[PDB]
């Protein structure tokens, strides 16, 4: 019945965790550092190490503090000597500091540890044990969406330092048996997985896989008001124009720039002609109370059901200077704003809460390693929010054709090696079908694997893309 949505079918992909091999266990040597904090006693350490010195090496602790220095871990690693790899247990059983999701203590220490190994000239693969930071499918709940932020930057770290980055090893919340059962093989594994999710039912590797689009009869309409965060910025700009086209009764482009944006009046006029009741508003999204009084400022004449969080600030994404607070104030518009909108709308009957994210958390992207965590927090929020009673869609938008929110130096590079500009006149239909199937976390990109294979698996063979069929070429 459909031929055009076939282009949409080639656009939408999804991340599914397929049962991979636990790796091939090789007797390690030198030392394996169980780098973590010292605040609480950790049975995680005793459980990880019991198969670490039994792995052939010895176990050495590396207490890293929040922004303790980009160098401290380097001279400590040089102090012990040659290391065959490190186990970051700082991201286990750790709450989100409610100040900021990207100010997660671990993310900062992971970045500092990565660049300390780079500066320590040690050259060993780092492994980051995470406590259920990602789900093996919607049958599991992502405990802390902030933790996936590490995973986000993790998928980028390998594109900078294949020798220094080993990968991530997700383990279930609370139980440390999976560590003892698999870490020894996993860290030493010749399988090649950089993304690991140890569960009671086995070992799962993250996999990009084709999303099927039979074009389900269900139709999502923009009925209600639409909180288009960053509505002036193209990522939200063409989305708001499309809303108005589809018949949005009300719109609420909201952005600190707002009326003071280069293109505000023009945009408003366009959607005012296509749809009706469009409103641009100069309002912060980082503050919880600003959004609180904005949603209370949402007229009781029209309920809110379509929060389309699109704002995302970005200057640079190089691991060389990437520290946790840097990621934070780089993408606070994205994460805190999304957290505020989530916590506010928990009591709202939203028919859509589409978080607009990018490929930076889908696959690795140099120059977006600071833009990746925010998108990873977005993906985790929709992964849980769908594990509750509030629908959310974390579309990983590839290079938007017209925006400038992530359309920067990295976008023009990737244009000639894989992800190409996805036209709005088909990416808007991809969003429609991601709300017709109610896809929890879709990935809409126009990636050509002819150029992508030698731009991703070249520096690090990755089993992520060994599920897409036409990814062989």
């Amino acid at each position: 019945r459909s031929t055009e949505v076939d282009e949409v079918s080639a656009l939408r992909y999804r991340i599914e965790w397929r049962p991979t091999g636990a790796g091939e266990p090789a007797r390690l040597d030198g030392t394996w550092l169980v780098a973590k904090y010292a605040g609480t006693a950790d049975e995680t350490s005793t459980a990880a190490r019991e198969a670490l010195e039994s792995a052939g090496a010895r176990v050495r602790e590396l207490v890293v503090d929040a922004r303790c220095g980009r160098d401290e871990l380097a001279e400590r690693l040089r102090s012990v000597g040659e290391v065959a790899g490190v186990l970051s247990l700082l991201a286990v059983d750790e709450a989100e500091p409610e100040e900021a999701p990207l100010a997660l203590a671990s993310l900062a220490d992971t970045l500092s540890l990565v660049q300390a190994m780079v500066s320590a000239e040690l050259g060993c693969p780092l492994w980051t044990v995470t406590e259920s930071a990602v789900a093996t499918g919607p049958f599991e709940r992502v405990r802390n969406a902030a933790h996936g932020a590490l995973w986000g930057v993790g998928r980028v770290i390998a594109l900078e330092n294949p020798a220094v980055w080993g990968g991530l090893v997700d383990v279930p919340a609370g139980s440390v048996a999976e560590l003892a059962r698999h870490l020894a093989a996993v860290v030493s594994g010749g399988a090649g997985e950089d993304q690991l999710a140890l569960r009671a039912d086995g070992v799962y590797g993250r996999r990009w896989v084709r999303a099927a689009a039979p074009a389900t009869d269900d139709e999502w309409k923009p009925t209600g008001t639409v909180l288009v965060t960053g509505g002036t910025g193209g990522v939200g700009g063409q989305i708001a124009r499309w809303l108005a086209r589809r018949g949005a009764p009300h719109l609420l482009l909201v952005s600190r720039s707002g009326p003071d944006a280069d293109g505000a009046g023009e945009l408003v006029a366009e959607l005012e002609a296509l749809g009706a009741r469009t409103t641009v508003a100069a309002c912060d999204v980082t503050d919880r109370e600003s959004v609180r009084e904005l949603l209370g400022g949402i007229g009781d004449d029209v309920p809110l059901s379509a929060v389309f969080h699109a704002a995302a600030t970005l200057d640079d994404g190089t691991v060389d200077t990437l520290t946790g607070e840097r990621i934070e104030r780089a993408s606070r518009a994205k994460v805190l704003g999304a957290r505020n909108l989530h916590e506010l709308t928990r009591e709202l009957d939203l028919t859509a809460f589409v978080l607009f994210s990018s490929f930076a958390s889908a696959f690795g992207a140099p120059g977006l390693g600071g833009y990746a965590p925010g998108n990873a927090y977005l993906d985790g929020l929709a992964q849980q929010r769908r594990s509750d009673g509030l629908p959310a869609t974390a579309v990983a938008w590839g290079t938007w054709a017209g925006s400038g929110m992530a359309e920067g130096p990295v976008a023009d590079r990737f244009r000639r090696h894989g992800v190409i500009e996805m036209p709005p006149e088909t990416a808007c239909r991809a969003l429609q079908n991601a709300l017709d199937r109610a896809e929890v976390c879709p990935i809409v990109i126009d990636v050509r694997w002819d150029r992508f294979l030698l731009a991703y698996t070249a520096q690090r063979p990755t089993r992520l893309f060994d599920e897409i069929d036409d990814a062989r070429r």
């Binding site: 499918g137 049958f139 769908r386 109610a438 896809e439």
Partner: protein, 48 residues
């Protein structure tokens, strides 16, 4: 084996872990907040 089941029945282990990812199940249309959405499943796991 009927011996590896006695190592699940004797040490009190539940085999309910999660839904299969091998089988190409959608796993995304299976779960929507609306409990009456045609095509969705209610159990978030099971011994598979």
């Amino acid at each position: 084996t009927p011996e590896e089941f006695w190592e699940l029945l004797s040490e009190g282990r539940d085999a309910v872990a999660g839904l299969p990812t091998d089988r190409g199940w959608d796993l995304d249309s299976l779960f929507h907040p609306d409990p009456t959405r045609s095509g969705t499943a209610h159990q978030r796991g099971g011994g598979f």
